[PDB]
Design a protein around this ligand. Structure first.
Ligand code: MG
Ligand code: MG
Ligand code: MG
Ligand code: MG
Ligand code: MG
Ligand code: MG
Ligand code: MG
Ligand code: MG
Ligand code: MG
Ligand code: MG
Ligand code: MG
Ligand code: MG
Ligand code: MG
Ligand code: MG
Ligand code: MG
Ligand code: MG
Ligand code: MG
Ligand code: MG
Ligand code: MG
Ligand code: MG
Ligand code: MG
Lengths: 187, 159, 225, 53, 147, 125
RNA sequence: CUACGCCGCGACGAGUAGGAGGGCCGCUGCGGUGAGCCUUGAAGCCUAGGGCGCGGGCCCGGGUGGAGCCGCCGCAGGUGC
RNA sequence: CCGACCCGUCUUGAAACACGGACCAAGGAGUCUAACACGUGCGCGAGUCGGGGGCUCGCACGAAAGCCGCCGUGGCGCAAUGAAGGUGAAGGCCGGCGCGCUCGCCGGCCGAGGUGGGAUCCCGAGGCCUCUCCAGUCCGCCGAGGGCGCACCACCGGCCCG
């Protein structure tokens, strides 16, 4: 025998979309060809983002996309997001944007098109720039989910600011002993 | 079964060396500790204030805070199967500068000079220190003397 | 345009033909030069001791700088310090072998795994037979047999090692790129020693097989591969 | 027993709840019966508004 | 779908995924939140601090309708009216500002998170915050009160 | 689309036969009768099929016209070939290779026609 | 080239409690599909009959029996001793 | 001929002088509901959800499916914090005046700050071309360095409640 260890042999990663959506699997087929047959690492990132779960493909708001496109030297570039683009009613002036997204909210769609923008699907993006040249690969906030407020250290430990799992928020619900110096301790 | 006293088992660890009792020499109060420099935590027993815990005796850490009569040190203490960076306040009697880092700074100062000097004047020189190499070939002369014969000696009962 | 593109292709075939020919002549001449260098090393060691004995003095030869380390004990029940050092020598299996450049750091690593290895100083014939018969290359994390010179050239040609003769010279005479050439060598998977071992559980100097045998490792190699 | 993080739950099922369980398989039949009675009332008050005063 | 569950795979394994040593017994540790202060104290202290004890004044007959007062920030303010309303004010040569009645949209208090576009507007509400009125004033608007 | 309709019926189809670690497919225009995107006889804008004739002599080579895609009544053009073995295969090869009509099915169609023609000559003892 | 497909190269393979994946392993019922099977013999049962699969199991011949049964895509379990 | 102790089981240790098992057939044990938590799939997305009600030949299937929108009441989310009265999340810079008093009146713009990392993307010296050359024609590839920096991490500021 050999003096090795087999507990890390199988790398745990998505090698295909767990979805059975055929329109998704078709452009997974397409970008699997583009990643293999070109030297562009853009196609590789897009391909592996097509396998990711919905929690790993968070939505990108309209305000966040406009902010990233406003950065210097990013004009006349196609904003590419592997996920959903979402309208933001906190912005008032939507510029002209050429944008390729996996899915666009029907209200975000109208505002972009009204501002003279262009919307592409990923099959139109391949014919546009197969190597992903002149694109800005954006992403939604991965940790912007309610679950991440609960993750981290345990709530009853010092210097931890993680949200406890409580059925209700009120002065009767998990606030006395361990939460103030007058009832036991505070940490 | 063992007690949890803060100074259990420090009978010799915190005691003074033989014939080294008395007044604390005052150069130990004139050392300058900035932030980020490397200190060794001894923990002498003459001064009972600000004593390091016995687990940090002999360990080495890096200063991060400097107060009137003490420093804060980030020192790694291994707990079971993990290592975590404790932050302890220790009075300056119980520490001293670590000579390991002081010599490493010296080698760097010599390195940057050596790079500039040699590159200016044309040739390349070795800066990485190598481990001890195998001994080279050399001629060992006899100087006209035959090497002395050695034999094991007969056994005899000493005492 | 068929005629012109045909001639352009035949020009590129011929240029490749010339370049392959020129690389072969270089390989031939490097090996001829290495043969001259080796026999110079052999004659010089003899001559230096020869001239010392004429004067009545001694010629202490230069200490060996290359070793071949063979694991001789299995993987069952090994202390954690020995297990770690053997993994650092890439000896994870019984009757595996590898070349070790010798200095203070490596020698003290050998002393720790002393009961688990037999090692020594291989001679030139040992280096030839191991690389030629049992020589594999770790190319792209795979164990690819060294059946063509282009395998070495694509992975070690940037160091000047572009043939098996270059690899053997780099290993035998411990060159600047010994670490890269040696790490490129997949650890040698030798057979059981034909004719058997004396006793694997004791040091060589006490009628066993473990520990260091200075030049007697070559006798073991002939049986092992 | 609690296991790692979780929510402190207080299920109100300590009181023999299985004797008093209300099923709604008669809900579609109840909607039909109500709709029928609404119509019958509407025919009974012929020109008056069907939804009442 | 019971066919997709662990029970269909644990046939033939005698312990049914619950161990041979410690087994699957009825209630080891008590039922429910048993022993939250004695033998489950570590879990309660670690994950639910503040669980034990009283804090604050108890108030009988709390009517949730009396304290009903939903809030809307300044950034979502302009969405309470039509899209036509805002642009008509912005291109209006006359400095006639529109009226936003947040009580009509279901809010009572106007809070001051975000920023407002540079056009005056009259905002009607039951309550304002200090920074909310400050920012409405800063764009040339007006803060008026209702009941 | 051929690829879209393939993603629908690659596993859920009435013509599918999964049996004995094999997978066949029985739509009318499937040369080699195999469940494959290349040989599927329903999803492509242009397909070719070879069948025996109504009588027990000759073949009927059928091709899909390009215009009436959604009009299955007229979507197929059937012609009968009732010549000797060598002249028949030349007509099928010319129909496919010369017209550039699905050249990837040239050899499958020729082999299928050979099977049909050989299945029509009298059986031996 | 059933791209959920096919091919190439290298390394490796112990396992209780336990976890996970695959199952063209198996039972029963439902929605589809097989212009499916069947009194010219279904289910069931027996068999020194022929085979397949690592295996769970399955197919086929012979006999008895005398009226129902199964494959594939999904769905649901009072589903394997 | 070689090997070969009886399974199950609790056990540090079972072939055990430990317990159950004479044999065969049939039956026979992690189910359902409720509540959470996390993961994944789907629709819509600062929204979302009709689940209770009503309307459609009153009903084989159909106790299904479809529709409502002045049925969205309501739930959950979009705002937190305090025992509570209550309060409640915009900043960056250039300028003139007090005193640019550690600072107030404003203007102008920009619209969540900055540092270190950071996939991807952009610019790019100089190279890779043909029978050859002095002279460029149009784009293809490699590439020193340079630039904007997604998500995320560390840190430093900033805003809200006590
Ligand atoms: Mg093995
Ligand atoms: Mg293992
Ligand atoms: Mg004191
Ligand atoms: Mg042993
Ligand atoms: Mg022999
Ligand atoms: Mg098991
Ligand atoms: Mg059993
Ligand atoms: Mg195994
Ligand atoms: Mg059962
Ligand atoms: Mg027992
Ligand atoms: Mg016992
Ligand atoms: Mg036993
Ligand atoms: Mg006994
Ligand atoms: Mg007994
Ligand atoms: Mg018992
Ligand atoms: Mg008995
Ligand atoms: Mg049974
Ligand atoms: Mg309904
Ligand atoms: Mg409401
Ligand atoms: Mg940053
Ligand atoms: Mg901060």
């Amino acid at each position: 025998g050999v003096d090795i260890r087999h507990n890390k042999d199988r790398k745990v990663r998505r090698k295909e979309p767990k979805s059975q959506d055929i329109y998704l699997r078709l452009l997974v087929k397409l970008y699997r060809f583009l990643a293999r047959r070109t030297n562009s690492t853009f196609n590789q990132v897009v391909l592996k983002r097509l396998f990711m779960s919905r929690t790993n493909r968070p939505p990108l708001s309209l305000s966040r996309m406009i902010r990233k496109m406003k950065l210097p030297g990013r004009e006349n570039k196609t904003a590419v997001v592997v996920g959903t683009i979402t309208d933001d009613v906190r912005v008032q002036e939507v510029p002209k944007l050429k944008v390729c997204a996996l899915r666009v909210t029907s209200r975000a769609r109208s505002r972009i098109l009204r501002a003279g923008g262009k919307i592409l699907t990923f099959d139109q993006l391949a014919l546009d720039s197969p190597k992903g040249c002149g694109t800005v690969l954006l992403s939604g906030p991965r940790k912007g989910r309610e679950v991440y407020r609960h993750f981290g250290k345990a709530p009853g430990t010092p210097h931890s600011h993680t949200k406890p799992y409580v059925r209700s928020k009120g002065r009767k619900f998990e606030r006395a002993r361990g939460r103030r110096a007058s009832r036991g301790y505070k940490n | 079964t063992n007690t949890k006293g803060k100074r259990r088992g420090t009978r010799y660890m915190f005691s003074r060396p033989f014939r080294k009792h008395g007044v604390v020499p005052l150069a130990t109060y004139m050392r300058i500790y900035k932030k980020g420099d490397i200190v060794d935590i001894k923990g002498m027993g003459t001064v009972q204030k600000g004593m390091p815990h016995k687990c940090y005796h002999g360990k080495t850490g890096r200063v991060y805070n400097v107060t009137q009569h003490a420093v804060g040190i980030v020192v790694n203490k291994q707990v079971k199967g993990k290592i975590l960076a404790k932050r302890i306040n220790v009075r300056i009697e119980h520490i001293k500068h670590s000579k390991s880092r002081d010599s490493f700074l010296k080698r760097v100062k010599e390195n940057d000079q050596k790079k500039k000097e040699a590159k200016e004047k044309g040739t390349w020189v070795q800066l990485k220190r190598q481990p001890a190499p195998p001994r080279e070939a050399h001629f060992v002369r006899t100087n006209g003397k035959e090497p002395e014969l050695l034999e094991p000696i007969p056994y005899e009962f000493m005492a | 345009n068929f005629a012109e593109l045909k001639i352009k292709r035949l020009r590129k075939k011929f240029a490749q033909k010339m370049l392959r020919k020129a690389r072969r002549k270089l390989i031939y001449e490097k090996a001829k030069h290495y043969h001259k260098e080796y026999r110079q090393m052999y004659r010089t060691e003899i001559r230096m001791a020869r001239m010392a004995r004429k004067a009545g003095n001694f010629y202490v030869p230069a200490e060996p700088k290359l070793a071949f380390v063979i694991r001789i004990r299995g993987i069952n029940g090994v202390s954690p310090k020995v297990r770690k050092v053997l993994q650092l020598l890439r000896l994870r299996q019984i009757f595996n072998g590898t070349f070790v450049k010798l200095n203070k750091a490596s020698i003290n690593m050998l002393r720790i795994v002393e009961p688990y290895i037999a090692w020594g100083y291989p001679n030139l014939k040992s280096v030839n037979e191991l690389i030629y018969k049992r020589g594999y290359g770790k190319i792209n994390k795979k164990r690819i047999a060294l059946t063509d010179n282009a395998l070495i050239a694509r992975s070690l040609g940037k160091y000047g090692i572009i043939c098996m003769e270059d690899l053997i010279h780099e290993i035998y005479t411990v060159g600047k790129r010994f670490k890269e050439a040696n790490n490129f060598l997949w650890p040698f998977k030798l057979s059981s020693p034909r004719g058997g071992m004396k006793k694997k559980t004791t040091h060589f100097v006490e009628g066993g097989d473990a520990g260091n045998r200075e030049d007697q490792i070559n006798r073991l190699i002939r049986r092992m591969n | 027993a609690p296991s790692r993080n979780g929510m402190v739950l207080k299920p109100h099922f300590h009181k023999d709840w299985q004797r008093r369980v209300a099923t709604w398989f008669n809900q579609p039949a109840r909607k039909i019966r109500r709709r029928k009675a609404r119509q019958a009332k509407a025919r009974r008050i012929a020109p008056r508004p069907a939804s009442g005063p | 779908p019971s066919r997709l569950r662990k029970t269909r795979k644990l046939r033939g394994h005698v312990s049914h995924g619950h161990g041979r040593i410690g087994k699957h017994r009825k209630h080891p540790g008590g039922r429910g939140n048993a022993g939250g202060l004695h033998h489950h104290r570590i879990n309660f202290d670690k994950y639910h601090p503040g669980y034990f004890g009283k804090v604050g004044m108890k108030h009988y007959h709390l009517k949730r309708n009396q304290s009903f007062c939903p809030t809307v920030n300044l950034d979502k303010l302009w969405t309470l009216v039509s899209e036509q309303t805002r642009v008509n004010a912005a291109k209006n040569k006359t400095g006639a500002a529109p009226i936003i009645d947040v009580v009509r949209s279901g809010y009572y208090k106007v809070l001051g998170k975000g920023k407002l576009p540079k056009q005056p507007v009259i905002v009607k509400a039951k309550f304002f915050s200090r920074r909310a009125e400050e920012k409405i004033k800063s764009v040339g608007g007006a803060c008026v009160l209702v009941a | 689309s051929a690829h879209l309709q393939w993603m629908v019926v690659r596993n859920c189809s009435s013509f599918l036969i999964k049996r004995n670690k094999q997978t066949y497919s029985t739509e009318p225009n499937n040369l080699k009768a195999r469940n494959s995107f290349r040989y599927n006889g329903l999803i492509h804008r242009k397909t070719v099929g070879v069948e025996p004739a109504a009588d027990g002599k000759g073949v009927v080579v059928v091709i899909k016209r390009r215009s009436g895609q959604r009009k299955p009544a007229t979507s197929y053009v059937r012609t009968t070939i009732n010549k000797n073995a060598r002249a028949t295969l030349s007509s099928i090869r010319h129909m496919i290779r010369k017209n550039k009509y699905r050249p990837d099915l040239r050899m499958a169609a020729i082999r299928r026609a050979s099977a049909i023609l050989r299945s029509q000559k009298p059986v031996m003892v």
